[PDB]
Amino acid sequence: SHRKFEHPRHGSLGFLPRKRCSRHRGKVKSFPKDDQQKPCHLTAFLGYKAGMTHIVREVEKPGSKLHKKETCEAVTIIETPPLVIVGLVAYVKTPRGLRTLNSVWAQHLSEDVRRRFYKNWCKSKKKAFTKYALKYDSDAGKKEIQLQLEKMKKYATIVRVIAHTQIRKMKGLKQKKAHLMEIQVNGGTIADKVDYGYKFFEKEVPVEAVFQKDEMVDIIGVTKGKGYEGVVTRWGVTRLPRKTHRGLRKVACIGAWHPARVSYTVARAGQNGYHHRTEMNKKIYKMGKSGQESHEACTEFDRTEKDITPMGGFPHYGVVKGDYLMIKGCCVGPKKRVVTLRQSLLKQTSRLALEEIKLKFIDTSSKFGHGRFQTTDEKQKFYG
Amino acid sequence: VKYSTDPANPTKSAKAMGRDLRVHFKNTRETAFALRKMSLNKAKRYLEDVLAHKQAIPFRRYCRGVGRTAQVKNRQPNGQGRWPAKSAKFVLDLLKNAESNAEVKGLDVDALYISHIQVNQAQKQRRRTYRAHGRINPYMSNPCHIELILSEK
Amino acid sequence: EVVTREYTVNLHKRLHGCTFKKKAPNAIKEIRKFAQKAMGTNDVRIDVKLNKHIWSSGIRSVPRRVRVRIARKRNELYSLVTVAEVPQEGLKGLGTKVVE
Amino acid sequence: VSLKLQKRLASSVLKCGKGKVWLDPNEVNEISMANSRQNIRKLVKDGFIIRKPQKIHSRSRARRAHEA
RNA sequence: GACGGGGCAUUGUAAGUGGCAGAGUGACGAUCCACUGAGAUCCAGCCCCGUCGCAUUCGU
RNA sequence: CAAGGUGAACAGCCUCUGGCCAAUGGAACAAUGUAGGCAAGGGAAGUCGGCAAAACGGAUCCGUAACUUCGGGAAAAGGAUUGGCUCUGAGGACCGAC
RNA sequence: AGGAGGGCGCGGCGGCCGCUGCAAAACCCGGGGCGCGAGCCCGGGCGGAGCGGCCGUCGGUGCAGAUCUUGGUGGUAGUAGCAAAUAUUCAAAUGAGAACUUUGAAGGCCGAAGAGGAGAAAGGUUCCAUGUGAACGGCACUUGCACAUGGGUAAGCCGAUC
Numbered sequence A: 001s002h003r004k005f006e007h008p009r010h011g012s013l014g015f016l017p018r019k020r021c022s023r024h025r026g027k028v029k030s031f032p033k034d035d036q037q038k039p040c041h042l043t044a045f046l047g048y049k050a051g052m053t054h055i056v057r058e059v060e061k062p063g064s065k066l067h068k069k070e071t072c073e074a075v076t077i078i079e080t081p082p083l084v085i086v087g088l089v090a091y092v093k094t095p096r097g098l099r100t101l102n103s104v105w106a107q108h109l110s111e112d113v114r115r116r117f118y119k120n121w122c123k124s125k126k127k128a129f130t131k132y133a134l135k136y137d138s139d140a141g142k143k144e145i146q147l148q149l150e151k152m153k154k155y156a157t158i159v160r161v162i163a164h165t166q167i168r169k170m171k172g173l174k175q176k177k178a179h180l181m182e183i184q185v186n187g188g189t190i191a192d193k194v195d196y197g198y199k200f201f202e203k204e205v206p207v208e209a210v211f212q213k214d215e216m217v218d219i220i221g222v223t224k225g226k227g228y229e230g231v232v233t234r235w236g237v238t239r240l241p242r243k244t245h246r247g248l249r250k251v252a253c254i255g256a257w258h259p260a261r262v263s264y265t266v267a268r269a270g271q272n273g274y275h276h277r278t279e280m281n282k283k284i285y286k287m288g289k290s291g292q293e294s295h296e297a298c299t300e301f302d303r304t305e306k307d308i309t310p311m312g313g314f315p316h317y318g319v320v321k322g323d324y325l326m327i328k329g330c331c332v333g334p335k336k337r338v339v340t341l342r343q344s345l346l347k348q349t350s351r352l353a354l355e356e357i358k359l360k361f362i363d364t365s366s367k368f369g370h371g372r373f374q375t376t377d378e379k380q381k382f383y384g
Numbered sequence B: 001v002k003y004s005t006d007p008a009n010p011t012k013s014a015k016a017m018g019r020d021l022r023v024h025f026k027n028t029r030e031t032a033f034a035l036r037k038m039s040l041n042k043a044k045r046y047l048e049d050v051l052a053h054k055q056a057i058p059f060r061r062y063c064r065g066v067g068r069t070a071q072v073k074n075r076q077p078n079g080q081g082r083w084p085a086k087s088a089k090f091v092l093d094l095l096k097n098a099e100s101n102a103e104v105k106g107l108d109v110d111a112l113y114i115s116h117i118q119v120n121q122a123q124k125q126r127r128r129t130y131r132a133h134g135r136i137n138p139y140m141s142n143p144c145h146i147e148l149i150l151s152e153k
Numbered sequence C: 001e002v003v004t005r006e007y008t009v010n011l012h013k014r015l016h017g018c019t020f021k022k023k024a025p026n027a028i029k030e031i032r033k034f035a036q037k038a039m040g041t042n043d044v045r046i047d048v049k050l051n052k053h054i055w056s057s058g059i060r061s062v063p064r065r066v067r068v069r070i071a072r073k074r075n076e077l078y079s080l081v082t083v084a085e086v087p088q089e090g091l092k093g094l095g096t097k098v099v100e
Numbered sequence D: 001v002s003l004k005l006q007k008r009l010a011s012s013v014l015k016c017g018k019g020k021v022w023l024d025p026n027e028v029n030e031i032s033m034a035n036s037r038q039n040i041r042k043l044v045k046d047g048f049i050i051r052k053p054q055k056i057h058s059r060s061r062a063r064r065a066h067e068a
Numbered sequence E: 001g002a003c004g005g006g007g008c009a010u011u012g013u014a015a016g017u018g019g020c021a022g023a024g025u026g027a028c029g030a031u032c033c034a035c036u037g038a039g040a041u042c043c044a045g046c047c048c049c050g051u052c053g054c055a056u057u058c059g060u
Numbered sequence F: 001c002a003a004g005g006u007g008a009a010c011a012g013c014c015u016c017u018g019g020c021c022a023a024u025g026g027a028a029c030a031a032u033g034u035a036g037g038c039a040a041g042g043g044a045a046g047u048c049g050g051c052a053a054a055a056c057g058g059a060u061c062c063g064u065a066a067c068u069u070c071g072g073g074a075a076a077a078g079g080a081u082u083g084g085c086u087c088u089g090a091g092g093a094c095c096g097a098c
Numbered sequence G: 001a002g003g004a005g006g007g008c009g010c011g012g013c014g015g016c017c018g019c020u021g022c023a024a025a026a027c028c029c030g031g032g033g034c035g036c037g038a039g040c041c042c043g044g045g046c047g048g049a050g051c052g053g054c055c056g057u058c059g060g061u062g063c064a065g066a067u068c069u070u071g072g073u074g075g076u077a078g079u080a081g082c083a084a085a086u087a088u089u090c091a092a093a094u095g096a097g098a099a100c101u102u103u104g105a106a107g108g109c110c111g112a113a114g115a116g117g118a119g120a121a122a123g124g125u126u127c128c129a130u131g132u133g134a135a136c137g138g139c140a141c142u143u144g145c146a147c148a149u150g151g152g153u154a155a156g157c158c159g160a161u162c
């Protein structure tokens, strides 16, 4: 018989299976559509989640009750020091889909990125790319490099840069192995893309070359793991009555007599968390550039000299010394987790997209307690 | 005594035997399988490592409900392995008996390997257990016979 | 080699979240683990006065920090762990010290 | 070298509980060879077997509270 | 790495010494005040840096 | 047979004499259990049903309805107080205890 | 469903004809055949003392079932499980072997209508000493309410008895 009352189903079938992600670094599953009229540029970046704080700003939005009034907003800090370009990858079209044409690597690769090619770096002879580097010394070897680049200009339809992070700049990460990813170039002609990506070899590309203030971006990462979980927390089903024999944290009926099988749509217990997620439309509130006034947490209204890092450091992270992004709201994953930042796939012709953010105050109180001072200088002057 | 296998080099081989040994047959069968053509010195070190929890024994059959460890990941990609101490100590004792039998024959302890190892089921011994509603159930051990031949080549 | 040193063991962070009926028994096991890593000897002997000190507040309240002396001696080497003398002003500023 | 017979005999000889008998840990072999109540007596006179004192239960607090 | 130092945080002013402070009683005496936002704890999954250490396999 | 303290008390809780640590051990803290807790705002909307839980609780003072077989109801209901310290008064025997 | 005929096989008895320590019966075999078939014949092995065929006649004479009887054996499965009664730790000794035995120290519990000290029923040697092959003490044990060898219960007044 039909169910007595209607309620919508718990959870989405569009994120199935709720398993552990097969990767740790978030993966771009689709780059923005290439517009060959625009200049050559990168479409993605890698960063690390430092922590959260809250800001105060005055809202300019006609028709809203918040118009000309200040609002408090939680922001996530993502430390994004510049990436190093170490290679180029070309793709050609094919009736089966895109296919890697060839790749060209730079002569100098740091040991941080070379650790990525080893399970046990310190037990090995560290021979990776040692003979490849010899093409840049002879003259027949340089001929191959130029021939590979010319093949890229003639046959490729997609050109991507091979870039890695400078993971040793963040000492609190306690990691020497860099993160490596492919980033698409989305401007100009194929010859323009190849020339643009080749001039960047062994060079640092800052976050300001990819994103700007007040832009909506997509954040890709793996959420926080939680291990084996029951249906009440994993799927959000309701608890049974207190009187329930053999426990109350289950789904009561897991299916009818027919079909004589359990369906894939019924909530079951299993892994919760550590899933790949692509979250879009996160606004950039600030770009903190190392060696500039924009790096400090002082605003035009607050002239107090303070750093972005809260008192006592970012809990479980450390001190932010490199370039960073302030982003409205929450972000996937725990602290220290590597996050992939991608340009929006759609046109951002909206008021929230086109709004101009002006910060009034940045909180730098300690997040390890009920912090009440904005700086260590203020705390010491208070106690004498 | 006739074993199930002849040495095929009786002058260059030594044997050891044990009947009705009070150790689980299923555990000892896996231990005996793990050292089938092993050299004598590597077999001794492997069994001491099992006693010391440093090397696991792979459980291939008689494996239902056995945990996963990663110490057994080589030569058993699924982690199913364990450290049967009693079954390892009983085999170690037999290995020392055959080793001294070889020394009497004068064969060198080096270049000695297990050419034959076999675990057979002994007659079971009876004990008792008590169940709900005044019922009695069997409570049985499964002892085994172990045969062992070391050969030079 | 034969050497004698004085260490301060932070038992508070080693026993955080431990079950009440096992806090003093686990402190003894952490002391053994500490000596095995500090001197490399798999044979660690805990002095009876050190056992009394660990248990002097019952099974529950193990001291947060304990100044111990670990003397590595030849039998094949073993470590003998005893209670060390605390100077005045407590353990502040006290690192690992070499005895004699 | 079990001394469970000597502790039982000393408990009877000294007229106390088994929990009050102290056998010299450095004289385990000398106490062991004793097997009669006469030998136990010779060990008590020598000083290898001792009746431990009662656990202290003070009445100081009850006296103080009563004066209050 | 182990201690230690600093930062950060929680609780709420330690022990001790001193006081012509203290209902009163015949030296006692709750409590109060000063040293003293003190003392204690703080990664165990917080942040930053003077003393001491440091076997089994695989050939496309 | 049957001790000390608290207390009205052979209540509960702690201790002395005496007796015991015998109940397979080790590692780790997933789901679901079992036993035991807390939870903002609401307060039975839950459920056949307040099931379960929570609230009440000792002592002292005040005060206590209908109905009644005049004995009860009644600890009805409803209020207030309670620590520590320093004292003060009263109540005795031939110096003492509450 | 049912009836009948002709055959195959098992065990005796009366007869006849044989075999076998130069290896009978039984059992085993990817050995070779005969018969539509029930079955039979031979080969190789094991085994070590009896067996067969033909005629007649006789019978406790042929199994896949009966939640069939008795015995043995699997999968389940090295799985379910060993979670009440707050609790152990250190050093030493003994021993082939010690988380479990003994000593000392420490930390705890029973809390005197007890986890203390003694009796009536009931049990019958479990009591004590020494020793230890296995079994048993649902992990273990050097250890015992196990096992083996010895020892131990005294009345005119306590009881029965009246």
Ligand SMILES: [K+]
Pocket: A001, A002, A003, A004
């Ligand atoms: K229905």
Ligand SMILES: [K+]
Pocket: none
């Ligand atoms: K949620």
Ligand SMILES: [K+]
Pocket: A238, A239, A240
């Ligand atoms: K519910």
Ligand SMILES: [K+]
Pocket: B065, B066, B067
């Ligand atoms: K398992």
Ligand SMILES: [K+]
Pocket: E014, E015
């Ligand atoms: K003070």
Ligand SMILES: [K+]
Pocket: E013, E036, E038
């Ligand atoms: K103060």
Ligand SMILES: [K+]
Pocket: none
């Ligand atoms: K659980």
Ligand SMILES: [K+]
Pocket: F044
């Ligand atoms: K209701």
Ligand SMILES: [K+]
Pocket: none
């Ligand atoms: K016949």
Ligand SMILES: [K+]
Pocket: none
């Ligand atoms: K009499």
Ligand SMILES: [Mg+2]
Pocket: A002, A003, A006
């Ligand atoms: Mg409907």
Ligand SMILES: [Mg+2]
Pocket: A029, A030
């Ligand atoms: Mg895609």
Ligand SMILES: [Mg+2]
Pocket: A243, A244, A245
């Ligand atoms: Mg029920």
Ligand SMILES: [Mg+2]
Pocket: A367, A368, A369
């Ligand atoms: Mg916080």
Ligand SMILES: [Mg+2]
Pocket: B065
């Ligand atoms: Mg299971």
Ligand SMILES: [Mg+2]
Pocket: B129, B130, B131, B132
């Ligand atoms: Mg049972």
